Amino acid sequence: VHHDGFQTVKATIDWEHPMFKLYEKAKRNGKWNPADIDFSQDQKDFASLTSEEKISALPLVAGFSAGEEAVTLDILPMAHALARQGRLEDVLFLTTFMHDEAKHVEMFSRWQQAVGIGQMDLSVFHNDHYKRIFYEALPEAMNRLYADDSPEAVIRAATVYNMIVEGTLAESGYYTFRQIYKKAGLFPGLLQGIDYLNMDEGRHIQFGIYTIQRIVNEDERYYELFIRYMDELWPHVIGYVDYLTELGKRQQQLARTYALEIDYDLLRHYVIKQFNLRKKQISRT
Amino acid sequence: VHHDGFQTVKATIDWEHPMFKLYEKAKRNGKWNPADIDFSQDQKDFASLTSEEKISALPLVAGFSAGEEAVTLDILPMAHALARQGRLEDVLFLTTFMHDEAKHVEMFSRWQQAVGIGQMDLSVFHNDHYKRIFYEALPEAMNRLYADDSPEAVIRAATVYNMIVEGTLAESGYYTFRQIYKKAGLFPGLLQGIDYLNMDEGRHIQFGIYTIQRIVNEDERYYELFIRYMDELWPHVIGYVDYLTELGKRQQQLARTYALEIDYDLLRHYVIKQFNLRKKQISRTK
Ligand SMILES: CCCCCCCCCCCCCCCC(=O)O
Ligand SMILES: CCCCCCCCCCCCCCCC(=O)O
Ligand SMILES: [Fe+2]
Ligand SMILES: [Fe+2]
Ligand SMILES: [Fe+2]
Ligand SMILES: [Fe+2]
Ligand SMILES: [Fe+2]
Ligand SMILES: [Fe+2]
């Protein structure tokens, strides 16, 4: 349907808008290119591992590659909905959000290509709980926005995408990866990629917080919706984390070999800690 | 609806895909930031202009600010449609396309702000023909893709967006701006912007050509749709140009004051040339 008029013809960009400022920061701090990352030592590290040590890295990488591809695709209806609402500064920011996610997908796939597992189907490390979140709940919540852009719908989308998938699972995923492979001196190229990714994602979570808070600010009732939507997803979050833990505990060769005492109970509590932290970043008031 | 699986879990990105290669080039050649452009001399240039010289420049800027804003908003359905078809490399590319357009919107708005016309409503320089293309036909063709992603729908969208709006009107707009202010030595910040923008837009048109040609390749009968869609929009293209031309003759001062022969018959023939050139870049067979 038709454009009424255009904001940058009638007026200008709202230069003081928080998402415009976040967009400016994204351009400044968004220059990294996954094509520049040197994965040659990652290839040597991976080839050096035993077959049993080889697999133990794959479940997390499977989770990330699928995760980045999903969020690359699944942000488009948010961008559509806020565009339809005339929120131009939000849309400007979301162009950097989307391109960031494209680089994230690119980075993990380049790592798989480089270490020699591009042809391997990593879907086998997605359990029912992972599928419930990434194959189903995430795309359902986002796609809803094409036909229903109510505050309830926008809060739920931002909750699943920004606060759970990015803010709880991905944040925990980064930590985990550094806790394991940074200590083992493994996969320097991947860890460099993860570092750049973690920086991008700090901006993404700020958009999610801004979006949820601005709606809660309209009506305190939406705060309770936010809490409820977080809690509804927790079982799948922890169900996936438990699955990953149980896998790590059955394939402990890498831990032994590299002196690592992967404290899975520490990782588990970090996930819980992230979940509760996200809740605290939204105020009822 | 659900994801069946994911290409970068089952396999990898198709590293040889034409749109993946275009994506890589975009990242390499797309580092410019409108926020770094010095518009202080543009401000002084604009202030030194006579009132009649001031309104010589504004209709074109009006066309571009609205144009960039429209295409920023209106690419989203194309990205959605291609994503839903599983064309991952196309989607990776389109993230650079979209962020480019965001920078283009930004650049023209920064210029308006800097020269002191941000508070002016430039809508007054969009005539019925401009409105038909940018307020109506473009969003109608793009939004159609949410419910109809047929070959016919995708060709029509790429034709309006990439071949007419970008490849005919915008290409002719860049040229025109340089043919007028580069010679005059005016608005160096804006011209610097236009140059970076023109580089970006080369990639956008390549996506349009690839998309239209990959569909035409499946069935030559789509070639005739392409031509028909181009021709349907021509009356609004030239009708906007005549309105701009009509304005530019009714305002002689910037030309004469700045030593210029703004040859409007030359620019009109640039628009005509761009249009036939776009037609030629698609073949019945390739
Ligand atoms: C063993 C401890 C469990 C740690 C939790 C691991 C979760 C796997 C990570 C997959 C989700 C990635 C989502 C990306 C979101 C974005 O890019 O904005
Ligand atoms: C008198 C000479 C007329 C020349 C034609 C002038 C047309 C004005 C340009 C406005 C269209 C801009 C469209 C944005 C394209 C994109 O950024 O992909
Ligand atoms: Fe990401
Ligand atoms: Fe993200
Ligand atoms: Fe379970
Ligand atoms: Fe543009
Ligand atoms: Fe463009
Ligand atoms: Fe007319």
Automatic annotation (TrEMBL), chain B:
GO terms for molecular function: metal ion binding; oxidoreductase activity. Mn(2+) 3 binds at residue 129. Fe(2+) 4 binds at residue 129. Coiled coil: none annotated. Fe(3+) 1 binds at residues 68, 101, 104, 201. Keywords: Iron, Manganese, Metal-binding, Oxidoreductase. InterPro entries: Ferritin-like_SF, R2LOX, RNR-like, RNR_small_fam. Fe(3+) 3 binds at residues 101, 166, 201, 204. It comes from Geobacillus kaustophilus (strain HTA426). The keyword Manganese applies. Fe(2+) 2 binds at residues 101, 166, 201, 204. It holds the Pfam family Ribonuc_red_sm. This is R2-like ligand binding oxidase. Its cofactor is Fe cation; Mn(2+). Mn(2+) 1 binds at residues 68, 101, 104, 166, 201. Fe(2+) 1 binds at residues 68, 101, 104, 201. Mn(2+) 2 binds at residues 101, 166, 201, 204.
